[PDB]
Amino acid sequence: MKRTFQPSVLKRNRSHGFRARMATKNGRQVLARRRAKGRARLTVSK
Amino acid sequence: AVVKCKPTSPGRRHVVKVVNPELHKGKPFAPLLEKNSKSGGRNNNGRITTRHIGGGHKQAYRIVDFKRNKDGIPAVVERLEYDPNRSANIALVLYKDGERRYILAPKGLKAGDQIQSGVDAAIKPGNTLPMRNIPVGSTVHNVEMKPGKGGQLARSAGTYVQIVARDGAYVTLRLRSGEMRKVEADCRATLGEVGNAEHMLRVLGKAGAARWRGVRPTVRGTAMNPVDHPHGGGEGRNFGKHPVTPWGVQTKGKKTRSNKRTDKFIVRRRS
RNA sequence: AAUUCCUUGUCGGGUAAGUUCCGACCUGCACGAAUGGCGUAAUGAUGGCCAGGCUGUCUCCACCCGAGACUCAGUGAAAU
RNA sequence: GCUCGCCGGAAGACCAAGGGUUCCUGUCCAACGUUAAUCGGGGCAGGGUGAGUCGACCCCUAAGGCGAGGCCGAAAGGCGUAGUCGAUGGGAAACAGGUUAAUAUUCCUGUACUUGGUGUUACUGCGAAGGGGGGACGGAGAAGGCUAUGUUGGCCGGGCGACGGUUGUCCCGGUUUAAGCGUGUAGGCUGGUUUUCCAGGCAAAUCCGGAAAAUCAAGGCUGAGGCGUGAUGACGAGGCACUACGGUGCUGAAGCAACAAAUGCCCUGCUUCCAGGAAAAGCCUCUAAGCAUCAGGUAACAUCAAAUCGUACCCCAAACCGACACAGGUGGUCAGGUAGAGAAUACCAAGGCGCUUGAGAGAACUCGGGUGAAGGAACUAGGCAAAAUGGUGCCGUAACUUCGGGAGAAGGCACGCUGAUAUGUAGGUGAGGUCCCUCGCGGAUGGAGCUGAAAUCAGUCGAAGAUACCAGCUGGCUGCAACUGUUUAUUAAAAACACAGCACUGUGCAAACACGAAAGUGGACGUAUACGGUGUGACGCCUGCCCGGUGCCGGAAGGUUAAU
RNA sequence: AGGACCGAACCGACUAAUGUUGAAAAAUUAGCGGAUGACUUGUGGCUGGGGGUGAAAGGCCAAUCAAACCGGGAGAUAGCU
């Protein structure tokens, strides 16, 4: 049937994309916490 | 005139609308037109500001003049059209060198007559002069009571202003609201009445007829959830306590005027 | 009676019979004019009661067709 | 290889999102596809993604986001005027032939054109971040002129036949043709032509917005189709060349108008309507600035140049997503023949697939479909479920009613085929001649011709002719609810909710009111025929008393009385 | 002309049946129905935690919700287990 998440790299890159996160205090802090946990990707749209 | 629909299908018999066989039509004059945009009560600063608003079909704003600044030049009425922003309808005027303006409709529903403004102007509709000229006991139309706000009062369908008394530099005006006010006699007036006057006779007949104008259904405070209005859901047909605003405050019969700066101009107060 | 215990009140009508249906009544333990009152048609994802056609809902099922129950080979579980 | 079957508005064709080496040949078979596997979107290699014109970019910008100078805030953050992103909108540039194992509006061929420069030829005022016209916007209906689409005949090529018929009693298939460029016709809008004038369009204006004199009404703008030209090039059944009946080329018949026209055009039309329905730039035009045999503006041309993104493949699905090659979810464009009102529906067309477990069997029972005698709603809480009715021309119709409705009430006739009605009526379309002129894609008057419903009656035939698919159960009493609507994803759907209209209350507008720790915005660029608060519930007839309590108003003289 | 009668595309929940360790995170088969509207829809936005959204069920708010989800105070507290 239908899913609550449908595949879209346009809206993923708009909410969770690297520059989109960096352009906000809290998203830039999510990225700072990615670097604290050591996550190998900082974007999953590119 | 007003006309009533035939029972072609259910409920339609109730529909009554204002119709005028002399009322013109065309395209709006673009230099006095703006799209104006919907406001929807949804708020630039936070939560909603207004209630009972949502949707409604596209509309624009036709820019009407209440400043009447071009003095000593004759202007002619070119056409009178249906107006989407005020129930009085609005006329198109052409000045003697090529300028076009939108004006509040004078009475007569007719175009082709020429109008002027000054300290002395012809007795005919649309001509403007100061109230110090006239012997009182008549209709003054839209009045420049405060120069820094333009022509005030009587802007809706069939609205009128009566000039009651005079002495020296001042005159008194009585309004269909129940309020009566005092102004300087030098204040500009156009004299006579507003046209249409049938707008209050309209019967929508249909539950969708305000929906296309953006009017949202009204849900009762005593029916919606107890945290979402201070009254709260039943407890069927038992309202409980004294009526209040959605903001929890008593309102019925409690006067809210706090202005204090114009009360000296009000010579008889609305009851 | 969307308000009524004993109550299927009490009477009339429909019925082989009818706590249901239709119509009255007053003695509403407690309806009542905007916390509205009363009535009217098409109409209602509305509810109750009857008549006719049509019919496997039922007397009562009886036999078919396409797919599972079986079996053998291939690949071979889960809860416990 | 031969043969069979199913789907055929899909079980087909094209486009997109989203994914990502999936494409093709060349091999490999451990693991994968819950198998066999020699197959493969699997393993592992090798090859493949050719663009001035296609989708993006250009240039403008809606909703919205950001946001200077400025403001609000410890601050994260935010308001708002310029500015800047951003279309789902508005704005320059290619068609259809056949080629490769795999590519292509990307190649090669033919033909076309926009942008920019330079050269050729005639005419020439070009021009703001400003002024005018446009761009440019709703809902629906109805005239005119058509086109994809399709058959008959013409025309071409093929055939004439295993049992009988079939050389005029036909069968089979074709008859293809673009982008563009003229011609500028139908439809649409609109009066030409010279003269002069200007307290508006922020200055100027030759443009609009207006005025004045004269001459004359068909001058001008816009735009389907046809026709010609592009095009004797491409295509073509069918021939033929050669090594290779091995593929890879060459050649090539006929190539038309008669009628019906699609969901497509003229159409951003015309007409009508109340809910009165984006902006800007390119474009055209006005002038300022500036400028000169320039530059720019127009018609016709030759010749040179044309950055960058994207490009392999799949797709109502094994390449997206649903953990899976999962009975599921999913945007845009297309829908022929025969039948039929038809997009319903079947055989079919072009096209596709025959499955990522197979073999078999067959019992009580499980699931759906098929058959139904005599009885029939007895069953059941309930005709639920199921079956019957079912098409539309002509007939014939109650109560009640807001006169519209109820109503397709109820109750009836007819239906194939042929003949006779109308040897084919209605509906749509229509030559020449008469005609009016201006010449001419003439215009307009008309009715020889063309196409063509639905219907009737007789006679004969069947169980049955609305023959299949497709396709209304009928009548009556009655609580309650105006009607169309709203009501929670997978047990709680209506009488509850909303609505047309009714009342009370606050509001004179820098309203009252609200959100915003605000900057600000909404109220509303609405103004008392207008807005905020709360209840009522269309429509017709309608509205008793009580101000002690708890709220509110009028009075502020008196009392009570605080911080002070 | 139409908050009009039937009805494709389009939409969609009411009855019945199948499914229910499924193909399945809600489908399937048949029917009745919504289809110019108080409608529906392609594409991109905007509305947030006592806040949103609701012709208003405390329904919906990415399966969760008389108060979502994650991470922290938090190894809080339990005369009890």
Q: How far apart are CA B135 and CA B138, in angstroms?
A: 8
Backbone angles phi, psi at A18, to 5 degrees: -60, -55
Amino acid B84 reads: P
Strand D bases contacted by the protein (CB, 7 Å): 17-19, 63, 76-80, 132-133, 135-136, 138, 198-201, 208-210, 273-279, 320-322, 328-330, 402-404, 482-484, 497-501, 504-530, 532-539, 550-554
Closest C-alpha to B162, from B135, B184, B141: B141
Show Cβ contacts of residue A44 under 8 Å, excluding neighbours closer than 6 positions. A12, A16
Backbone angles phi, psi at B93, to 5 degrees: -120, 140
Q: How far apart are CA B197 and CA B87, in angstroms?
A: 8
Strand E bases contacted by the protein (CB, 7 Å): 1-4, 24-27, 37-39, 44-47, 50-58, 62-63, 67
Residue B258: CB atoms within 10 Å: 6
B111 touches strand D (CB under 7 A): no
Query: Hey, what are A26's tokens?
Result: 């809290």
Map out the domains of chain A as residue ranges: 1-46
What CATH class does A1-46 carry? mainly alpha
Way the structure was solved: cryo-EM
Amino acid B147 reads: P
- Cis? peptide before B235, omega within 30° of 0: yes
Concatenate the DSSP letters of all residues of A1-46 into one string.
---SS---HHHHHHHTSHHHHHTSHHHHHHHHHHHHHT-S-S-S--
Mode of pairing for the β-strands spanning B180-184 and B170-175:
antiparallel
Q: How far apart are CA B130 and CA B143, in angstroms?
A: 9
Final resolution, Å = 12.0
**Smallest CA–C1' separation from A2, nucleotide:** D329
Q: How far apart are CA B194 and CA B173, in angstroms?
A: 16
Residue–nucleotide distance: B86 CA to D303 C1' (Å): 66
Query: Hey, what are B46's tokens?
Result: 């936070």
Q: Which residue has the tokens 């056409």?
A: B79
Extract long-range pairs of B160-166: CB within 8 Å, 24+ residues apart: B160/B193, B160/B194, B162/B138, B163/B131, B163/B134, B163/B136, B163/B137, B163/B138, B163/B139, B164/B136, B164/B137, B165/B136, B166/B136
